[PDB]
C-alpha cells in the first residue's frame, strides 16, 4: 500500500523492497606484527646524556607502539602536544626523532614549547609550536652519588641563547670584558659548563631525572614510521565485513582453487570487481562472494477479495531468509499445489500463483493447455458438418494524452 501510494490494491505481484543479508561481524587482517621501532635501546639502556650534549635517536622504517609508553606506569610524567597519545597508534610519519638527557627535577619544567631559563636558553630549546611528546622519570636511584656525581653537566654561560634544537657541545670561554681569555677564565671570562653534582639526599627539584623528548614529521616523501596494525581471527562461510591489507569490503569468504603467483595479493573479475584475496598472515587464497540479496515481491489477489498475501524473495535461497523453494526464489505464505492451471499471477521459471480454496494463495506449475492426440492416418479425413458464426473483440491503443511543458516555468517559475 505504501509502495503503490494507495489504500486499494489490484491483483498482481509488486516489488516492495530489497532483501540483503547483513554482515555478522567485522574481520581485520594485516601481515604479522614485526619490525617494531628500537625504543628499548632509547628508554631502557644503562647510560644517559648530559643536558648540554643530549643524544638524538632517529626513528624510521619501523612500526611504533606508543601504547607501550602511554599505558606504562614507569614514568613520573608523560605528555603529548598537538596530538593525542592514543591517536599515535594510528598516525604514520616520514621521520620520528627521540632526544635524551639527565636534568634536575625543577629544570624539567623548561622542557616545554617556547620555554626560557638556563636549560632552554643554553642546553636544549623547543619551539613554541612543538608537536610531539615528553616522557620523564626521576633517576635519583641511578644518577645521584655519595659526595656528588660528576658525570652530569649543564652549560651555565654562553655568548648568546640557543635556537630550536641547536646542538652546540662546545666548551669555549664566554667573555664579557677587555681582559683576554687565551683559553682560560679571568676578569669577565667564564668556563661554560658546570656539574649538577647530584646527591641522593637532595630535595625533589634538585634530584636527577632522565627525560626523552619525541618529535614527528610527515612530508612529501612516504611515511617510514607507522602505527602497529591490530588483527582479528579469520571467519569463513558467513557474511562478514572485512579488511585485508587495507582492501575493505563485505561478503562471504571461502577456500578456493585459484593459483595466485607469490607477489599477487588480490584477484579480479572481468569487470574490475575483486573476487579473491590472500590472507596476509597465513597465505590461503579466499574466494569472495557477495552476501545474498534480491528483490522482495508481494503476491496479492485484489484487496476487494481478501487481505492475504504471499512473499517472494527473488533469487534468494530459503536458508538465507507455508515455506516453499522455487527457481524464481524463496516463496512464503503460498500453499504448493501439484495440480496445474492457467497462469493467474506469474512468478517465473514455470511457476504461477492464484487465490483459491479454507481459501489461500496457492503456487503451481503453469499448464500450457489440454493434450490432444490428433486421430491421423494415411486414409481418414474429418469434415465439418455445421458452423458457428463467432464475434471476437480486439482493442488497440491509437493515441496518448497530448502534453506541453514550459521548461522555464517548471524549472524556475
Amino acid at each position: 500500500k505504501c509502495t503503490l501510494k494507495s489504500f486499494t490494491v489490484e491483483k498482481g505481484i509488486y516489488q516492495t523492497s530489497n532483501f540483503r543479508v547483513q554482515p555478522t561481524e567485522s574481520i581485520v587482517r594485516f601481515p604479522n606484527i614485526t619490525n617494531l621501532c628500537p625504543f628499548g635501546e632509547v628508554f631502557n639502556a644503562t647510560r644517559f646524556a648530559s643536558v648540554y650534549a643530549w643524544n638524538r635517536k632517529r626513528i624510521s622504517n619501523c612500526v611504533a607502539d606508543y601504547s607501550v609508553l602511554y599505558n606504562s606506569a614507569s614514568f613520573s610524567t608523560f605528555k603529548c602536544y598537538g596530538v593525542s597519545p592514543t591517536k599515535l597508534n594510528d598516525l604514520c610519519f616520514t621521520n620520528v626523532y627521540a632526544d635524551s638527557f639527565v636534568i634536575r627535577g625543577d629544570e624539567v619544567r623548561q622542557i616545554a614549547p617556547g620555554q626560557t631559563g638556563k636549560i632552554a636558553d643554553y642546553n636544549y630549546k623547543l619551539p613554541d609550536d612543538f608537536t610531539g611528546c615528553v616522557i620523564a622519570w626521576n633517576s635519583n636511584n641511578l644518577d645521584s652519588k655519595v659526595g656528588g656525581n660528576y658525570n652530569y653537566l649543564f652549560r651555565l654561560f654562553r655568548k648568546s641563547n640557543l635556537k630550536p634544537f641547536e646542538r652546540d657541545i662546545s666548551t669555549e670561554i664566554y667573555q664579557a670584558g677587555s681582559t683576554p681569555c687565551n683559553g682560560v677564565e679571568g676578569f669577565n671570562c667564564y668556563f661554560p659548563l658546570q656539574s649538577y653534582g647530584f646527591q641522593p639526599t637532595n630535595g625533589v627539584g634538585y634530584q636527577p631525572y632522565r627525560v626523552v623528548v619525541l618529535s614527528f614529521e610527515l612530508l612529501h616523501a612516504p611515511a617510514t614510521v607507522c602505527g602497529p596494525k591490530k588483527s582479528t581471527n579469520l571467519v569463513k562461510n558467513k557474511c562478514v565485513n572485512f579488511n585485508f591489507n587495507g582492501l575493505t569490503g563485505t561478503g562471504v569468504l571461502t577456500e578456493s582453487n585459484k593459483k595466485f603467483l607469490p607477489f599477487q595479493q588480490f584477484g579480479r573479475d572481468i569487470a574490475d570487481t575483486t573476487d579473491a584475496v590472500r590472507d596476509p598472515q597465513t597465505l590461503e587464497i579466499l574466494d569472495i562472494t557477495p552476501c545474498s540479496f534480491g528483490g522482495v515481491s508481494v503476491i496479492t489477489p485484489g484487496t476487494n477479495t481478501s487481505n492475504q498475501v504471499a512473499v517472494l524473495y527473488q533469487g534468494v535461497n530459503c536458508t538465507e531468509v507455508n515455506v516453499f523453494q522455487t527457481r524464481a526464489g524463496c516463496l512464503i505464505g503460498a500453499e504448493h499445489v501439484n495440480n496445474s492451471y492457467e497462469c493467474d499471477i506469474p512468478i517465473g521459471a514455470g511457476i504461477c500463483a492464484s487465490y483459491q480454496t479454507s481459501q489461500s494463495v496457492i503456487a503451481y506449475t503453469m499448464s500450457l493447455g489440454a493434450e490432444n492426440s490428433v486421430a491421423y492416418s494415411n486414409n481418414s479425413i474429418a469434415i465439418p458438418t455445421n458452423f458457428t458464426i463467432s464475434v471476437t473483440t480486439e482493442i488497440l491503443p491509437v493515441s496518448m494524452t497530448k502534453t506541453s511543458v514550459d521548461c522555464t516555468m517548471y524549472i524556475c517559475g
Partner: protein, 205 residues
C-alpha cells in the same frame, strides 16, 4: 651501438591476479621493436625509468648507482650484490669518481648461459625493481620471445633520480615511455603475451 628490443621489457604492472583474460593498462613500458643502447660504463640519463639487461655466466655486473649528482653533495641510491646477499643503501656517498669492483644514510636494506633482465622506475617516492632470468640461444643480442618481469622490491626512498650508472660483459639499456599495452593473462595468472597499442594500425585494432 644499437640493437632491437623485439617484444622484451614487459613487467607485471600491479599486485593483482587475473586469469584467462585480456587486460588493458597504461604505464611506463619499453615500446615494442624500439632500439636499445648496447655496451660491452658511462653516467646515463634515467628519464621516466629504465630497462636494463645483460647476457651472463660469470657475475661481471655487481650493482648500480642512482640520483641527481650520484656523488657526495646529496643522497643517492646504491645497489650491490655482496656475493652471498644483495645490499642497498641511500647515503650521501663520498666514493670514487669512476667506481668499480676489481677482479648519513636515511635507509638501508639487505635481501654465456643466461639473460638477466631488470626494470627500474621511481614513481611518487617509491623505487620499484622488477626482474627475470632465462637460458638463451644467442649470446650477442636480445632473445626474440616473450616473458614478463616480476616485482622484486618496492622501496620507500623519496630521492630525486635523474641519472644512473652501472657497477662492474654485454649489457643493454632502454628507456620506458608512457604507453598503453593489452596484456594476456593465462589460467595460472601469468602474463603470456602483449600488444603495444601504438606500434602499428593492427595493434590499435
Amino acid at each position: 651501438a644499437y640493437t632491437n628490443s623485439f617484444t622484451r621489457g614487459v613487467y607485471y604492472p600491479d599486485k593483482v591476479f587475473r586469469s584467462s583474460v585480456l587486460h588493458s593498462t597504461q604505464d611506463l613500458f619499453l615500446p615494442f621493436f624500439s632500439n636499445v643502447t648496447w655496451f660491452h660504463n658511462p653516467v646515463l640519463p634515467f628519464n621516466d625509468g629504465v630497462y636494463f639487461a645483460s647476457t651472463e655466466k660469470s657475475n661481471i655486473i655487481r650493482g648500480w648507482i642512482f640520483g641527481t649528482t650520484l656523488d657526495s653533495k646529496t643522497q643517492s641510491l646504491l645497489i650491490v650484490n655482496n656475493a652471498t646477499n644483495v645490499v642497498i643503501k641511500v647515503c650521501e656517498f663520498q666514493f670514487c669518481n669512476d667506481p668499480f669492483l676489481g677482479v648519513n644514510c636515511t635507509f638501508e636494506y639487505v635481501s654465456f648461459k643466461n639473460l638477466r633482465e631488470f626494470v627500474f622506475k621511481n614513481i611518487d617516492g617509491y623505487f620499484k625493481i622488477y626482474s627475470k632470468h632465462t637460458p638463451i640461444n644467442l649470446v650477442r643480442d636480445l632473445p626474440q620471445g616473450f616473458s614478463a618481469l616480476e616485482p622484486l622490491v618496492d622501496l620507500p626512498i623519496g630521492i630525486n633520480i635523474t641519472r644512473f650508472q652501472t657497477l662492474l660483459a654485454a649489457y643493454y639499456v632502454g628507456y620506458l615511455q608512457p604507453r598503453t599495452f593489452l596484456l594476456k593473462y593465462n589460467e595460472n595468472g601469468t602474463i603470456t603475451d602483449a600488444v603495444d597499442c601504438a606500434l602499428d594500425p593492427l595493434s590499435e585494432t
